[PDB]
Symmetry: C3
Subunit: 270 residues, 3 copies
């Protein structure tokens, strides 16, 4: 049996049931979303995770395969560092952290033949190997005073269930394989400089990438999917999104209000 | 014939053709987006409707069923109550109302076999007993003055066509059943207390839920759908979305610009 | 054979392959994102293209067919024009211009039979005559002074490859054909008045319509696709979208605190 074996489980006039057994490498990238509150600038409203996409290409047994990965997080805890109510003290209203109770979803899609018309899937199984994700240092750059840095944090992604999924983006709409990863916090705690809380585990959402362009996981899967008989097909994967038009409308309404207010401020000042 | 029968009508080596009839409970919930204008704080910019999602689960004949619902609206009426031209008095630029000319859409999906690979459907029909929706009270919190309250309003949803559709949320993508609802006004007319606009029918977006956890419609549907021959297949249903990076970037640029403006304001103050 | 030919190239008990050959007219409208920076009002933040929808209907040979089109671009070139570093003079940080290197994607869908269940497609070929898109004139609204105006720009869109795609909107998710258009810049350059730069070719994002309601491209395509034999089968066309709830949350937080700051500013002014 080959590492990249292909088998026709069943065939008919218009359809077939191809079994694909591929060895893959999953290169994903955590997505952080940092927003700083107004005022003096010592208060950070949210430090939250975000579904992040990474598009790469790697080397199969002699083949160049373009892959698209999308990492999101499920059930992250909402912690918060608070020092005082005045605008003088550093504060984070809320920041998301990955913990034992949470899960990490990674959706992978490949240019290979195993994904060309993937809609239906038998017996989806895969073996992956765990990985260490260590959080980096992020500097809360204040205009005066110190620069409290959040540091530490480390988790171990351990493989768990696999299902189908979809990868929607402005550019593509892929039918992908989703692997969930349970978690086990590693040893190094995580803490902030000039902060009361210490000796805590997890992975803060500040810079979970921690310098690395990606976290690499080697794995392989085994699926059987209906694809119609011949191969010269283009199921729609490339996309075109014009979604949340009401959201866009209210966003531009807020922007024009902000521009008018700022112009009024400038006119008053000058 | 059973309430939840699973009937065949044509079978082939790869594909079959199931007739599904199910008794369902459609629990949905209205959505609203209150956007209050800037200025002195007496003006509201829009009181609109939103396509609101609602997960739940209810007991079938001895077994749980998890359901996903999405209530949206079409053809709303844009009323506008203007207290006066001054920036000191209560005012609303626009608010959406539900009247006869409009429609209410409710998309529905379950974790049962009837939706396992629902991608093609014919002979679709259903019977849904009507329902009534009465709008609750919403207090417009002005900086000074007795709070005006929009209340009243009640509209009865009567059944109309049933068609296929798709529910898209941040986490999932569901091939769902859409139910159309025509509307009839009812006795209590919506209006604002301590206000001039009176005796006008419909339902306003201020609080269509009226403290109800949901609006429940008992119902059943019938459909016939191609699905693969054996039920061990899974079309992708669970989703990851990163669309509108344009809106993401625009909002982030606005955030940083506003942060600079607010920092300048506070620094000038101090 | 006729202009609107329909064939059955291979039939089976449940599925069949139909070769559809039909004419089309692709009326598509460009999209723009005019964004205003804060400050005195002498600065523009970005003038970029946007994925724009357009729904219409036109008379086929005796029939009246409704159509949906979605225009978008990629690889657009960012040009920056600054009068001077001071904040009193007119300046534009970035505007996006389409040149020979970039492309235009036009996605197209109809009510007609060709798109009833279009998922899998063979041998998709088409013929589209070229079009000429000439930009209009957009007046930049300076606070006080001689309003600078960007005018000109013109590109000939020539046909290129054609593939499948999916148009996502707040109402309908359409399974569509994407036509790729290469570009060749035409004679009349694009220029801003009260300016130093001259005779640079392209099409700026300020106003790619010239007041035109659309750009009409006569067309005819051809494709073979699986559909179920029973023509009563319907794939879900209609849609109900609620993606990117994080954007709603962030925008709402921004608007609430912005209202707070506006209250502070207005009260201080009073």
């Amino acid at each position: 049996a080959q590492v990249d074996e292909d088998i026709i489980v069943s065939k008919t006039s218009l359809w077939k049931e191809m079994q694909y057994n591929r060895d893959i490498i999953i290169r994903f990238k955590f997505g952080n979303s940092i927003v700083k509150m107004g005022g003096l600038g010592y208060k950070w409203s949210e430090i939250s995770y975000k579904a992040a996409n990474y598009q790469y290409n790697y080397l199969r047994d002699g083949e160049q395969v373009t892959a698209h990965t999308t990492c999101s997080v499920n059930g992250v805890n909402n912690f918060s560092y608070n020092g005082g109510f005045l605008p003088t003290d550093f504060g984070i209203s809320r920041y998301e952290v990955i913990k034992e109770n949470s899960y990490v979803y990674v959706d992978y899609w490949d240019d290979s033949k195993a994904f060309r018309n993937i809609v239906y899937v038998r017996s989806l199984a895969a073996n992956l190997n765990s990985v260490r994700c260590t959080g980096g240092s992020y500097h809360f750059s204040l205009p005066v005073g110190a620069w409290p840095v959040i540091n530490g944090g480390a988790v171990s992604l351990h493989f768990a269930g696999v299902t189908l999924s979809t990868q929607f983006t402005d550019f593509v709409s892929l039918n992908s394989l989703r692997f969930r990863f349970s978690l086990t916090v590693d040893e190094p705690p995580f803490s902030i400089l000039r902060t009361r809380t210490v000796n805590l585990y997890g992975l803060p959402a500040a810079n979970p990438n921690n310098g690395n362009e990606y976290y690499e996981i080697s794995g392989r899967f085994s699926l059987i999917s209906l694809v119609p008989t011949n191969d010269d097909y283009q199921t729609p994967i490339m996309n075109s999104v014009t979604v949340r038009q009401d959201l866009e409308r209210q966003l531009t309404n807020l922007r024009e209000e902000f521009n008018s207010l700022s112009q009024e401020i400038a006119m008053a000042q000058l």
